Paper text:
FGAR-AT encoded by the purL gene is a multidomain bi-functional enzyme that catalyzes the fourth step of the purine biosynthesis pathway. The FGAR-AT protein from Salmonella typhimurium (StPurL) has 1295 amino acid residues and is a single chain protein with three major domains. The C-terminal glutaminase domain produces an ammonia molecule that is consumed at the coupled active site present in the formylglycinamidine ribonucleotide (FGAM) synthetase domain where nitrogen is incorporated into an FGAR molecule converting it into FGAM. While the FGAM synthetase domain and glutaminase domain carry out the two enzymatic reactions within this bi-functional enzyme, the function of the N-terminal domain is not clearly understood.
Residue numbers in the entry: -9 to 448, 466 to 1295
């Protein structure tokens, strides 16, 4: 029995959970203790759960809560032995696990559960340790920024203390004069300048009353660099001359020059451009039926950063970087839908233990920030965690490491990224009539949509918190709103970000020309102790603010309750330009201000600065040889394979991904840009690419900015766009403002792109952001040390795509071919600030640059001509690592060799191979060489174009210069060297057995890559005679909160002839839908409940513990002809419903992958013989499918049960390796399932559950790789057509 004790006015139940760490993780902890000379004999860990109860549980309810808290892999249980150390979230914080677990308990009828929380009990046997050594063990077992260690289970009562509300505090300006403001500036950390204090002193002296702490804090956050963008609005004097434009006005110059296709710039928290008229697919409000709505799907774009918080706590730093940016996209106009993301990281050197590289030197770091390696281990996991649980694919990115002592603009100093760049961005779609914000009527209701707040954000104040499923529930309300078209009730919406409601609400009513009257105690709160300052100014996540007409509140409440999206009306818009915040608890008014006070500011800044310019130093080549440089450059993280950043993030949710990072049958992550379809019924789409080249700014500020723009365009150039004016840019500027030379260099770089290169090319920059404190200082010896970033412009390019099918990738063909270099460097072959210089600890002399603007435009326009005429077999641009890395990566992606001659590229073979000038390599059919050279010559490119040679079958990578061999190596050896960084990252972050299997597989050149064998005609629509009758059977497309894959599931059943109906679990609980009216149902994928309490478990136990809904599902599954499919999260849910499903007694559980990591893979499976009616006709076929899950490993009770499942013949799909054999080796089997199993059916074949996603790849265009001869339908369309034909 579980523990039960008094806890304040409540009772606290303590429930023992399952064992918490796998064998490999226990071994790593033992190894770390041994490495610290901590003599630890054994460690075992178990989860422990704490339930704060507001009322007692009866026996039945106690058994339900016990069953809710049974989840996870069935690991080795041990009797507790040794010293207990209980690690929990810090008191005063509430984990996201708690928010979601508590939501499951309430949706299971346990309203007595006020809050659930979890810790980890470690039992350590180490009898000889001293007291100081026990503190070191404790330090090893928790994150000091987020957790605490306790010595008894009962200490967890500290996490549930209820504090009385703290009152507002007055700052006594009337009674003390200006010193009260000086004291408050220090006490509250307002970082006010003297002229900011003068402004506040006069404003309150004029009002004749003391400011409250909340009103000072709100104003300080509104007037910070971060929020007010004073540097980008400043006036400048440079070298003694006043300049005519601010940095923002030079950005806006690009929209004054090129307004084409722009629908919204600089007036929302994303830009919008024109898209394409296509079928937007969603379920109608009245009927619940999914349908296509033919209309423009315009395209929104935004890119943000989260640099400071990621230096302190990288997982939530990066997660809430993604999360914040997703809210900016959904809050565009009057509501919009995010569709695909991008991610970037810049960090200092990794210094992976046991894999030190020769250019890396430990310079030390501040105590209070984490290392570059910790950022790259936990940060990409947090950004992926948000994109995967919210449900947007993450399809392009960058990752740079840089940290070196260099002779730059301010002479010799350390330049790097101890404060990293953490960048998150994406694209979304929006309806034309919702692009413009609406008018806010006087008396509009002012709402906060989203998460109850806590005291987050005000280094503890820099530790963020992410709950992506809350954001998905809010996106579903936003989507119901814009799907109502003219009846959309949102008049105005805005994300909540910096400053919390203290910035978002004043900005909302101000942007509508109104004031606002608000009620503090109507805001939802999970921390009753919070003061009015903490309630109004915290930066809790997953919130939006909205205005809605009072007469639309009943509709808005219906939409929210159906999605389980929390919301509160907290105020009313007023005609008076005033802002007031009242407190019904203290019967007072924490804020009472004219908006022109609140939104008043100090004068415009002037920045008077001078130019600094480094003299470059020629590269010292004494210890450089071509062969050693190839090996070093392939080991630079910036160049090396990025799998560890790619397969951790879904790349298929939505079913609209055409081109992801992984390319070809060997799934090599070298795609130069991302492409999505605009709908599920079109080949129009959208593309995203990134350019960045920060190390060049250590030699030439403007050259680094022009190369960022040029590389974004060379990355996107082999996608079918047409007019260069379709491409729109985000410009994200990271600098150390104030550091010598960086200010004049920022202005020079903004002018270089905004006044010069982008207007000359026809490129708009309609959105951007800036982060202006990119440096770190600490005391290292008893000496001051500093690490300052280069000026770091990241350009993201976004474009409407005219046909996604015509995109080229770096996969070489071995058909008769020609490789052509387009060298936009014009033979300059610069080596300054290249990966070659960096790997020999140098900066060099002169960097690359845009050498000829008309030739850059001509190269783009020539590429677009060649793409549209279908004249290219492959493209890959030149960037980090030069021509050598471009050619190596094309041979990796084509799994072949190259024979290249570089005698035309200069006598300096090192510079010809390793310069990072713009350009790239095209591959064409040999019969088309002369035509393509003439086409390039009509764009002015003839002297830039050079025939290099040919791609050849086999494994030789050969570069010659006339009769001399310059470099020759096995392509497999190069490919494995270029994989060693991801190998080492995966092996320190994930199960090392799996990291090792994936790496070693790359060294087998005989791998034939993904390949297909089909047992049926993929073009035969067996459902066509039924569709032609017009009789369309319904399918219940089942979703729970946190499901994210329902739209494409409905679209696959719709193509097979069904009427797809949106059935939320709330519809079944509210009686709006009854399963008796359906003959088919599908449980869809995603992250219901964030997978807390085990993937699929909350959704299944919600059904089981409501007897009415339980019986509905049992009745459905017991009818004689009904069909059901569960995919991914649906598979997990239905495996937890066995008890309701006949013929399911042998089904396994689905638990954490053996790798211990989310796996987003394009995996090969074979269809096996089973009763499944949904796989009729397909037995023996082998083809790839989208895999995207963290808990897909089949787990049985013991081998008796595996053998029985097998002998009953219910396995319907198995993972196979590329040789065709059933496998458990990773990642060909991505999850470790026994015998490759990844789909099972019932004895009667009418219910099938599977972990992969056929509905993400039912369109050939959405398959990462596929045979060239396939038509619109992939093989997986046959599952949906078999369901239609079976219904008859
Ligand atoms: N941080 C990241 N997250 C996700 N994908 C990434 C990341 N960094 C790089 N990638 C992807 O890895 C591949 C190789 O990246 P990279 O070599 O930096 O591209 P390029 O050199 O073409 O600019 C590309 O498909 C890129 O989108
Ligand atoms: Cl019980
Ligand atoms: Cl990702
Ligand atoms: Cl059945
Ligand atoms: Cl499960
Ligand atoms: Cl088979
Ligand atoms: Cl393909
Ligand atoms: Mg690259
Ligand atoms: Mg590229
Ligand atoms: Mg790049
Ligand atoms: Mg065409
Ligand atoms: Mg119930
Ligand atoms: Mg694979
Ligand atoms: Mg194996």
């Amino acid at each position: 029995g579980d523990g039960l004790v008094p806890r304040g006015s409540h009772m606290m139940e303590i429930l023992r959970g399952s064992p918490a760490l796998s064998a490999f993780r226990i071994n790593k902890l033992l190894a770390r203790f041994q490495a610290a000379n901590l003599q630890v004999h054994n460690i075992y860990a178990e989860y422990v759960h704490f339930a704060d109860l507001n009322a007692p549980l009866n026996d039945s309810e106690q058994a339900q809560l016990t069953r809710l808290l049974q989840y996870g892999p069935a690991l080795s249980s041990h009797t507790p032995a040794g010293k207990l150390l209980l690690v929990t979230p810090r008191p005063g914080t509430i984990s996201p696990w708690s928010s979601k677990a508590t939501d499951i308990a309430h949706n299971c009828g346990l309203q007595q559960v006020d809050r659930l929380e979890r810790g980890v009990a470690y039992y350590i046997e180490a009898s000889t340790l001293t007291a100081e050594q026990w503190r070191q063990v404790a330090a090893e077992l928790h994150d000091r920024m987020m957790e605490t260690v306790f010595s008894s289970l009962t200490d967890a009562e500290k996490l549930f203390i209820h504090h009385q509300p703290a009152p507002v505090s007055s700052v006594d300006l009337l009674g003390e004069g200006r010193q009260a403001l000086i004291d408050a500036n220090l006490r509250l950390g307002l970082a006010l300048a003297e002229d900011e204090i003068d402004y506040l002193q006069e404003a309150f002296t004029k009002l004749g009353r003391n400011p409250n702490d909340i009103e000072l804090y709100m104003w300080a956050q509104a007037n910070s660099e971060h929020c007010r963008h004073k540097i980008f609005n400043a006036d400048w004097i440079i070298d003694g001359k006043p300049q005519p434009k601010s940095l923002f006005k030079m950005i806006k110059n690009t929209f004054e020059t090129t307004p084409d296709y722009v629908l919204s710039a600089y007036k929302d928290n994303a830009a919008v451009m024109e898209g394409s008229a296509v079928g937007r697919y969603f379920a109608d409000h009245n009927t619940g039926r999914y349908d296509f709505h033919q209309e423009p799907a315009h395209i929104l774009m935004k890119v943000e950063t989260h640099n400071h918080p990621t230096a302190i706590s990288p997982w939530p730093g990066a997660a809430t970087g993604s999360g914040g940016e997703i809210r900016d996209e959904g809050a565009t106009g009057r509501g919009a839908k995010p569709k695909a993301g991008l991610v970037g990281f810049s960090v200092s050197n990794l210094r992976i233990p046991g894999f030190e590289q020769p250019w890396e030197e430990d310079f030390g770091k501040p105590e209070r920030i984490v290392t570059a390696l910790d950022i790259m281990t936990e940060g990409p996991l947090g950004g992926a965690a948000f994109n995967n649980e919210f449900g947007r694919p993450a399809l392009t990115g960058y990752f740079r490491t840089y940290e070196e002592k260099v002779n730059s603009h301010n002479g010799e100093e350390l330049r790097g990224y101890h404060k990293p760049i953490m960048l998150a961005g994406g694209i979304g779609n929006i309806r034309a009539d919702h692009v413009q914000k609406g008018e806010i009527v006087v008396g509009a209701k002012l709402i906060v949509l989203g998460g109850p707040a806590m005291n987050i954000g005000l280094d503890f104040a820099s530790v963020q918190r992410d709950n992506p499923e809350m954001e998905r529930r809010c996106q579903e309300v936003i989507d119901r709103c814009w799907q109502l078209g003219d009846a959309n009730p949102i008049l105005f919406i805005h994300d909540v970000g910096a400053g919390g409601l203290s910035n978002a609400m004043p900005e909302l009513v101000s942007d509508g020309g109104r004031g606002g009257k608000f009620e503090l105690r109507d805001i939802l709160s999970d921390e009753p102790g919070m003061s009015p300052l903490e309630i109004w100014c915290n930066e809790s996540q997953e919130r939006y603010v909205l205005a809605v007409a009072a007469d639309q509140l009943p509709l808005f409440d219906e939409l929210c309750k159906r999605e389980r999206a929390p919301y509160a009306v907290i105020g009313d818009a007023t005609e008076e330009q005033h802002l007031s915040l009242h407190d019904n608890h203290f019967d007072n008014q924490p804020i009472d201000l004219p908006l022109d006070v609140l939104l008043g500011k100090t004068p415009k800044m002037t920045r008077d600065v001078q130019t600094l310019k480094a003299k470059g130093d020629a590269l010292n080549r004494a210890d450089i040889t071509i062969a050693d440089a190839v090996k070093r450059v392939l080991h630079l993280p910036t160049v090396a394979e990025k799998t560890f950043l790619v397969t951790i993030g879904d790349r298929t949710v939505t079913g609209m991904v055409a081109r992801d990072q992984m390319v070809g049958p060997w799934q090599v992550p070298v795609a130069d840009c991302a492409v999505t379809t605009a709908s599920l019924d079109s080949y129009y789409g959208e593309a995203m690419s990134i350019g960045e080249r920060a190390p060049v700014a250590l030699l030439d500020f403007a050259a680094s900015a022009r190369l960022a723009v040029g590389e974004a365009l060379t990355n996107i150039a082999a996608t079918q766009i047409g007019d260069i004016k379709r491409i729109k840019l985000s410009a994200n500027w990271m600098a150390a403002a104030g550091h010598p030379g960086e200010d004049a260099g920022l202005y020079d770089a903004v002018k270089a792109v905004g006044e010069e290169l982008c207007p000359q090319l026809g490129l708009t920059i309609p959105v951007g952001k800036d982060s202006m404190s990119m440096k770190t200082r600490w005391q290292e010896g008893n000496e001051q040390r500093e690490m300052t970033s280069p000026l770091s412009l990241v350009i993201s390019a976004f474009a409407r795509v005219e046909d996604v099918r015509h995109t080229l990738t770096p996969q070489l063909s071995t058909e008769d071919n020609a490789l052509l270099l387009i060298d936009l460097g014009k033979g300059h072959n610069a080596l300054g600030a290249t990966a070659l210089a960096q790997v020999y600890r140098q900066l060099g002399d002169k960097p690359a640059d845009v050498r000829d603007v008309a030739q850059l435009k001509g190269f783009y326009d020539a590429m677009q001509a060649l793409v549209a005429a279908r004249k290219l077999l492959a493209w890959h641009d030149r960037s980090d690592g030069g021509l050598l890395v471009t050619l190596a990566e094309m041979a990796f992606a084509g799994h072949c060799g190259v024979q290249v001659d570089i005698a035309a590229l200069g006598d300096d073979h090192l510079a010809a191979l390793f310069n990072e000038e713009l350009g790239g390599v095209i591959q064409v059919r040999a019969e088309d060489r002369d035509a393509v050279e003439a086409l390039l010559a009509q764009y002015g490119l003839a002297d830039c174009v050079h025939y290099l040679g040919q791609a050849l079958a086999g494994d030789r990578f050969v570069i010659t210069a006339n009769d001399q061999t310059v470099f020759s190596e096995s392509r497999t050896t190069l490919r494995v060297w270029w994989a060693e960084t991801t190998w080492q990252m995966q092996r320190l972050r994930d199960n090392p057995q799996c990291a090792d299997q994936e790496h070693e597989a790359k060294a087998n050149d005989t791998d034939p890559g993904l390949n297909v064998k089909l047992s049926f005609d993929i073009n035969e629509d067996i459902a066509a005679p039924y569709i032609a009758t017009g009789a369309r059977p319904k399918v219940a497309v089942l979703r729970e909160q946190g499901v994210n894959s329902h739209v494409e599931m409905a679209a696959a059943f719709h193509r097979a002839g069904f009427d797809a109906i949106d059935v939320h679990m709330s519809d079944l609980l509210g009686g709006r839908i009854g399963l008796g009216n359906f003959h088919a149902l599908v449980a869809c994928g995603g992250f219901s409940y964030g997978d807390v309490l085990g993937a699929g478990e909350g959704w299944a136990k919600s059904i089981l513990f409501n007897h009415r809904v339980r019986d509905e599902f049992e009745t459905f599954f017991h009818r004689p002809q009904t069909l059901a499919l569960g995919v991914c999260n649906g598979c997990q849910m239905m495996s937890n419903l066995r008890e309701l499903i006949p013929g399911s007694e042998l089904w396994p559980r689905f638990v954490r992958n053996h790798s211990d990591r989310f796996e987003a893979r394009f995996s090969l499976v074979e269809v096996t013989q089973s009763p499944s009616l949904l796989l009729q006709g397909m037995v023996g076929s082998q083809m790839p499918i989208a895999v995207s899950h963290g808990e897909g490993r089949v787990e049985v009770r013991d081998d008796a049960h595996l053998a029985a499942l097998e002998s009953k013949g219910l396995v319907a799909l198995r993972y196979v390796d590329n040789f065709g054999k059933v496998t458990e080796t990773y990642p060909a089997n991505p999850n470790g399932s026994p015998n490759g199993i990844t789909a099972v059916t019932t004895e009667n074949g009418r219910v099938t559950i599977m972990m992969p996603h056929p509905e993400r790849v039912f369109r050939t265009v959405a398959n990462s790789w596929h045979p060239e001869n396939w038509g619109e339908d992939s093989p997986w369309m046959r599952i949906f057509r078999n369901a239609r034909k079976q219904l008859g």
